[PDB]
Amino acid sequence: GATHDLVYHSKINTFVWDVEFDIVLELNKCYFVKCFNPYRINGDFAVSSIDIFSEGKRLLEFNFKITKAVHVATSKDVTEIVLHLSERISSPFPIVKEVVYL
Amino acid sequence: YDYHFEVNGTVVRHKNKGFGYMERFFELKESCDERSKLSKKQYERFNALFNFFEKNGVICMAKDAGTLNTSIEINSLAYHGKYDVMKKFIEEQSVSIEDDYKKAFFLACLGRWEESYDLYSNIILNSIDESNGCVYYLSQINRYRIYQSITQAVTQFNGYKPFTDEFLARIEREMTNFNIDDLFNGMPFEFQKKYKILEFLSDNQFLYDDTVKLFELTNKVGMSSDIVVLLRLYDNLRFLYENCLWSVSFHEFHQYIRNSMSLLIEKAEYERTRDIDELGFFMEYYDFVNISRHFKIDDIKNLERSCSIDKIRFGEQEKIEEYLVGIAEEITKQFSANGMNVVFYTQFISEAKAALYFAKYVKLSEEGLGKIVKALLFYFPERDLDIGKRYVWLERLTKCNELPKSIISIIDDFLVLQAEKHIDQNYSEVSSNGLYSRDYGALIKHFEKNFISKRLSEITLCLTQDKQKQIDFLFKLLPLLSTNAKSHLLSFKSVENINDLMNGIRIGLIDEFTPEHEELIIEYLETRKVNYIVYMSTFGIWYFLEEINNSKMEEFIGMDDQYDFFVDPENFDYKKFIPSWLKNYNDKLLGKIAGNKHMKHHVIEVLKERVKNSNDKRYLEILMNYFI
């Protein structure tokens, strides 16, 4: 029940909101950031780029059924809510905890 | 209220029911015969008053107007950022109490708040009787302001170790219930009469009338009040720094220049874009300083966003180069050693980040660009710029400039340093942005694609197997190597990956594209077909761009509608073309989709549908700047 922080950055169709993912792609304490560099030099043809964290980079081979997602503040497993935001959006990584906007 | 003193040096009359004494004074200025008529003591008084009026920038009546050349010249070492000469003035011995007052303000500026507090106290103890009162009144104010900066400063530094607790106890038992609102009311009979213009300094909020005039700008706007407002900035700001006032460091003044420069930049933008009929803001050195110091980086971002700094030009670029090289050498000398005043570090690092960020637009020399780039890469501290943020700043410094090969040598040195630091198998490489050191290599390949790195060639002549991070990092730094050492790193050939040939191999490598990877794509898509009856866009774009060469794709229509949108543009059902799908594509693709007509006119109708129905401006900008 933490909809008071849910932002819908929609140049890249994300949902910037601090969750902490527990993944099977099996790890713990995951959180995601994304880029917005459309003028990127030699960095594929995509504007955004995921930078998956596991207290540092995991150094990526990724399918990721989502296993456990917990909000930071009230801890309130927001699992089904995250599924709902995956039930609508057809982009990779609906919940992305920061967006840089280069 | 005998005159109205306007900010150009022109004086008008208002309610002077009298002789017209200032008019007679200016008549005494031009007339040489009248100055002989006076007495000698009043002749010398006339010369002192003459030096006063020429110094403070009031030149003449509004009757005789003319070349109103207005220019601010702040003669204070604290404003320009000359931290060296400040220190050299402080350890010199002063022989006057007014030199002590400046010396106090200077080491108030350097973060040496304790010794400045004590020197504010000694002037009060030793200039009490009658100097003029001003270096007893202002120093007591400045002691209270530096008390408020210490007290507010240790509020959130704890919640790393700014001041001892004994000094906090001493200034607490000293400044315990200081009321500033009765200081001038208790100054003697002479001081209250001769200096009843110096009482707003003992008042908390005093810069607020000018704020209300800024609303006249923002409201319903030849000559304008714009320049007047700007020359009022240059009057208040010049008053604080030149009389050495510590009230500059607080947040009222910071909001003042923030709001004022914001609305003058947006105002001159507004007058520039009054163009719906008829097809300046020169930004001198002092404005470069004021933007670099009284903003944060996010403010300067938002001045790039809404108002457009493409039209804005920059002058006096040699002194801008001097300020920038001064920031470069000062961050160099502060971080070539252990030198850290934590307070002075915090204020200085705000000025430094903002100055280089806003130094994208100005032009430099080669050795100046070398010095700023060297200080930005090597001696610049961590926790403030990460190695992708350094690519943002450096990318700004290298975008509008043709790179004169010495910066290539410096960035090469930084790449050698990163390769010599990825030896330890615990390195993290923050830059939570997503930009990394491969992009530094890509930048060199963007300007000098024929560059060969010497020491990296020697390092790849010494990597057998043992240092895995150094191998992987140097693999992401691929194209800057020599062929024999290149193959020596290509001892570790790729795997059966598809988009981890992109994600694992982030160095292009479609120029070297094996035929069995067409076959591996065939294997992948037939497994996705047999599992389909039970990543992707990248090779769909690769077939659409015709960088790969295979006609197997035609039998795989239906697995992905993006892939259907990029394999067969003619037989694609544009009825079920998802729009989302258009914000994730860059200029090369959004700019060669327009090359494909069957795609282009259908997405013209659906983008007109979405721009007309909703109110998106991403789809509006893609509808204007690339497609049609």
Place this chain on the structure above:
Amino acid sequence: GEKLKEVFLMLDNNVVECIKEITESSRNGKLVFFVGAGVSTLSDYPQWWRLVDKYHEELYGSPKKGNYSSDEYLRIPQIFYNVKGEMAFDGILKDFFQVDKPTNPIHDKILAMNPAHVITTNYDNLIDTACWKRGKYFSVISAEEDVANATSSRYLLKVHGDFRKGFKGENVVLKEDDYLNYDQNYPLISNLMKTIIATHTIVFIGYGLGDYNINMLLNWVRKLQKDSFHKPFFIRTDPSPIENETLIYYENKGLRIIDAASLIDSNEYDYLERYSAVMDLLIESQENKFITKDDEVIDYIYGKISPLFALQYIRKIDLKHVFEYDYHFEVNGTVVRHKNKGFGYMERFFELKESCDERSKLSKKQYERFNALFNFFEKNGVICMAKDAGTLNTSIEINSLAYHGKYDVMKKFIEEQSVSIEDDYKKAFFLACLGRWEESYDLYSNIILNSIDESNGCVYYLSQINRYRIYQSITQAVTQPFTDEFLARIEREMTNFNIDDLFNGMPFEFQKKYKILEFLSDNQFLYDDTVKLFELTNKVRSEMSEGSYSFGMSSDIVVLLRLYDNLRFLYENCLWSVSFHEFHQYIRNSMSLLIEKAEYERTRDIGFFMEYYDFVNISRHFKIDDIKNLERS
């Protein structure tokens, strides 16, 4: 922090009454400490007997064997002064008094009670330099020519001199002949001290009941009348407790003794815990920590709000300054704590709101006081703590005929006869609104002529302000309508009206109970809210360009509810300051940036429902060209 509370529980009636008198005299600002030698000698300051010792050393050679009585403290220096002369006497004066002793905490506790004057009999520079370290200008008045050049109204009256002007025996009072014909050497200092004693609350601290200054002043107050003066206090810090015959005798002499040794348990040499004991008993008596009875918190709240039962509307950022920085009153009816080092009296008040059983527990007069305070807090739109939040339905309802534009009913109220002076004040404001500026000016004058003594002060203070504002509207109005005789009459009436000293000249009760009504006698007062509008225009204008469709809370609504707080304050208390251009710029700029702000949040696509009151505010505080430009951009 608990023992002092227990001492407050173990005090008798009389001492408690004395503490209440002292904290009353401090809170009005009529408190004048008469300190002495004792408050200085805990700074390890040189006492006088040591000087007499060294004087005896150069006088008779060998040390004196036994007792020093009173006059040896005057005679042995006097003999020294007749033998060795001025200069050597000044020498011992320099060598003993050129010290740099620090400041005791009891000087701080004296200077924490907000004294009007401070009278003293010391020779140091401790308490004045303690004031220079503070900000409280006490004009240090040590000699007779210091009196005529006294630069303030808060004194520091060293009534025996100081070594400020040199360490000479000419400037201070030390010897027997000096104390003898004192009142023909310093005739003016004593006049000022007796003036301050006759017009304030004198509290003695640092003396014993044998001191010549104390008995001298007690001789003077026996020369006076009976009912004229105020009985002084005497903080007694002696090693032995006070005896009953000394008590009966010196209370009948005129003093009011508060003992420190019979209030706590201490030792023979521990002075500082007794000075800090009674002196901090005064200070935490100011800090409301001793208020624990429910009746007492009703007394406190009624003591601070029963002034404001006359005003129709009170702003939230004024009620913040009624209970001075004890809470932060935010504009939704939710109250948070800030620096309430005390009982939590408002929290207990809201506990008294919901609980029905607690309201029966009080007394009947404080029950009716509770109902009046209840009607106050429901009227001004402050409902609850921020702990218990909920349906924060905020809605402005301006109940003023001048705002809605009902010009008919206004006229019909004006020609009706009023039977109260507060009906006259509204009636005046109404025909100020109708352009009938002359009759409103005269009715502003008649209320001043006929409500001067004590109604509440508010319909004497505000009507004088409103007369000056309608004077400024007439005078500025005829600049660019009225007969020239009336222009001459208000010119010879309002010729050099200074508004900046009106509240400074309102009486003792008015300045205390209505030190929230002084911004109305100030020219530019609506400017803080302007600076908050820049926070809107700044970087919550930075979110359109990224498409962030967020759905949270912003300062937007807060700003709008601050418009609806200032605007409601002006029209409902019938203030003519609405008609000027500061207020017009205020609603102009504020509504401009809220309309452009809600536009900005609407076009982050990469509410603002506009009720009746906003239609009114756009129709009145804009011009047509403004509304055009709100259609344009």
